[PDB]
Amino acid sequence: VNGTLMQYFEWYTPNDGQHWKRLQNDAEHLSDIGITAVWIPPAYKGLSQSDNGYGPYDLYDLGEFQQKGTVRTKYGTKSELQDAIGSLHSRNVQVYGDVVLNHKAGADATEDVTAVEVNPANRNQETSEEYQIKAWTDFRFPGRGNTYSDFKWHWYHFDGADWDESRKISRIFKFRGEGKAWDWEVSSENGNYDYLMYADVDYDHPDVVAETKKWGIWYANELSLDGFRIDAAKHIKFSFLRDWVQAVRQATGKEMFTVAEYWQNNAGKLENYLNKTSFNQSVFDVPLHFNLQAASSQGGGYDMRRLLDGTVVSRHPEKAVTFVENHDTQPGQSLESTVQTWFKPLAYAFILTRESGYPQVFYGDMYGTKGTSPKEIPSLKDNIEPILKARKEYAYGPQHDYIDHPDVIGWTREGDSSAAKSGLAALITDGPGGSKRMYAGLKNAGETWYDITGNRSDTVKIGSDGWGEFHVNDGSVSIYVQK
Template identity: 50%
Template structure:
């Protein structure tokens, strides 16, 4: 598996159509920085050239057809996309596509059909009888004119909508049909959390399944991507995702990487999802993200001994994609849970300097946020941490999680370089004795974070008394290893 992934976009990535061109231009630099894989934004046509990609319109249009006001997507044209992927591959960077299969938006025409209004907070409770409503559920893609697929979407391919234009009523409606109901195997929040937004796809419909499986085969061959990031897994039938993932792996083998967004804190529900999908899909470690957010907003009162409690990386390290923030958690977005700025370096040390998990860096941290809430780029800090990871973060790991405010760990190398001693304080200036190896006796250790100018001499037993400033992290290695 690649070493470090980057989410290459944030919600307010400029919509100038230059994203793919910039990726191609920066591919070599990204690889040299220590990025081995990129999670790209949704590649399919959304509601226009400003759409981040989650208002998904046409799966088969990757920026090739004049639809929804433009040929390109927010990120560029299909040719620019394929050129960027090719260049990333030349630089040994894997490419993961963000795949949005929960819903469709920005339909081409309205249709009338029978439905029932449901309780907003309990979608299994009907609050109306059978009524005729009118909604945007027709997709015939006139700009594409049947190229690649002549499939036309109608209301019976969906399970729900959120607007009736006959009455101008905004509410959640369950579409009626013979044997049709909300998908099973979804989150039980709101009774049944199948419905999220737009026209919700009915994954039980045989024509829908056939079309999506056909698209997946085409998309993998057309783009040559190396994996999928599944969007909105809480809202899609587990059985469908299992079947689709098995189909993909039968075609591509285990080297095609599948991971997804299952925005859930409850460990039993996470474990159940991993089990129900036969451990074919890795998941973002949402519990760890929430712990980081809580710690960053605790004014130093969070118990850092518990930072990994009930996280995916603690319980299922091979299934954990660890991250600090993403496009949904950034300020003002739907799952706003931003990790406070002072804690960012600490947070990245928790995913970059430990042995478990597949770390994912967020472009909104690396390049800065560019929306209404702006954040300065942390590129220099993260680049430095990546260089430390590449050179020092391997070998056995000894944890020193013995103080609520001050924790640390050591990666004891078995290679011809230094051990790595990491110490974190979310309170005052602190120090902690940690063992780095008897072979390190007599060596001077320096702080590669650049915050501590003193040196720590390792004693004859291989121990060092490492210090850290208030509310910060320090990462110590032998001075001798730097000069090699």
């Protein structure tokens, strides 16, 4: 059956500590609609209870220890997470854990460090004389102690930080020391994009490298994870991420599917990342997200024939996790690039009913986002579920593309022996609707198909030659399947 991923959280998921319970309770629903894997938010202790997990303090504290004024993380306790994972597994749904290895936040104390300021637009360029600062680099894990790992962090395990406690100033501080330099083989943006935020981990440090692989194996085992989602990959030494994934797979003997969040709308750079990680992990199809967002926001002027241009799914579908939206692109966020509501179901049809790519459904799109703007994403589960049904039960067999009009594009799937009634004919348009004749397969001759989305109430009779004339409304989507 087709695989479908679901990012199970949004930026405004509440800090009520009930998210793991929500996931456990949603297990049956997710399995029924076709979700086969869930990407959960960072499960370890952040700098505070309210942190979304991208400001990780202790990777070995899965909401288990008394650290940062809380036992549970924003999402819940370790046991509640394990219960959720157990429920998902009982329903044949896999779980991918978020991996945040770029930096550490919320150090226990500062340490005297000799550093130098670097140009934010070119981190290879020092901009000040070297001086002593008080950097938050001492991570001792007072609540966990040596449970699971006795590794303690110090300034020399980091390449830099952005805050000096002595002068109370923010700058991009690069640490001085034997062998200290920004990690190489990271995005070349800003000269060297190794530094992003908080205390930057030094992946040139052998102990850090070894300890992080040990943690990865521990993490996978502790939660019975089936895979990973790697955070801020373009800011982490590529060869390290390559080796880290390899180490976990070698130790667990499991596939451990991994998708990296390499955030750059550039197929060439994404290709480079794949090469530098020996194609051992997928990447989110950032270009496709931007193409979909462009189509949704250009008032019908976007040339739909170019929707696959420069996308990862077009070149390496085997390494592409296609998506419409995520917590960083949703309204008000750091990478804001929201696919407009009217086009959203069309975008989902594009990633869910086509043969290429591993598609991902966004929690915020299914259940809405709880931000405070006047443009929050509404709950679109009623529009998305019929499309998920199309993917689960009908998106099989030979595909025929008709991405041949600047507004109205479509494709068909003939269906195959995996499901006797599989097959579909999809049409989407970023402007006026209309009809398009498409070959749906001679094997479907004489059948009557209907629009599973319910947007149109008319049926289509497949001709004796396997062709049908399919219709779609203005700025809409229609997916015809056998009655």
